[PDB]
């Protein structure tokens, strides 16, 4: 599972996967979402 399962023979899962490469402010990403 996730974007790392390629490089691991065993099963790897992470609950916070979707937060990867997201350093932006959650309130402003929300504002963008309800804008669109």
């Amino acid at each position: 599972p996730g974007h790392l399962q390629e490089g691991f023979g065993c099963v790897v899962t992470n609950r916070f996967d979707q937060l990867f490469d997201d350093e932006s402010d959650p309130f402003e990403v929300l504002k963008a979402a309800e804008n669109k």
Partner: protein, 135 residues
């Protein structure tokens, strides 16, 4: 790879400033023979700006948009890293590691960190950084 970098927002886990949000100014992650552990120079806020509403008034809004800041050197084990990052241009010559010997310089570093936080608190950017963590 390594993620404790300048500009990264961390949460203070121990000390007087427990539960405060702060931004890493300098990371050492190697020791300095006087702090052999991995530590980082940190600029946080002591007092969060108060909630401001539309029916409040300019002077009261200005009074409530005031930030008290702190500068500290924290061991990594007392910091909780977050995924967020603020690119606030803190002056390194003012906010650096020699500032903890001279109290007058430390007031100067806290002053400089304060005004940069306040101007970034305006324009409504980086809202998560300037909100008190509820716990």
């Amino acid at each position: 790879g390594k993620f404790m970098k300048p500009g990264k927002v961390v949460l203070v886990l121990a000390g007087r400033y427990s539960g405060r949000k702060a931004v890493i100014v300098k990371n050492i992650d190697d020791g300095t023979s006087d702090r052999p552990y991995s530590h980082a120079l940190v600029a946080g806020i002591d007092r969060y700006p108060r909630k401001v509403t539309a029916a409040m008034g300019k002077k009261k809004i200005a009074k409530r948009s005031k930030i008290k800041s702190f500068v500290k050197v924290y061991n990594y084990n007392h910091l909780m890293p977050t995924r967020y990052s603020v690119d606030i241009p803190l002056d390194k010559t003012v906010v650096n590691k020699d500032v903890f010997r001279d109290p007058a310089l430390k007031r100067k570093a806290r002053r400089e960190a304060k005004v940069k936080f306040e101007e970034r608190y305006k324009t409504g950017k980086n809202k998560w950084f300037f909100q008190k963590l509820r716990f």
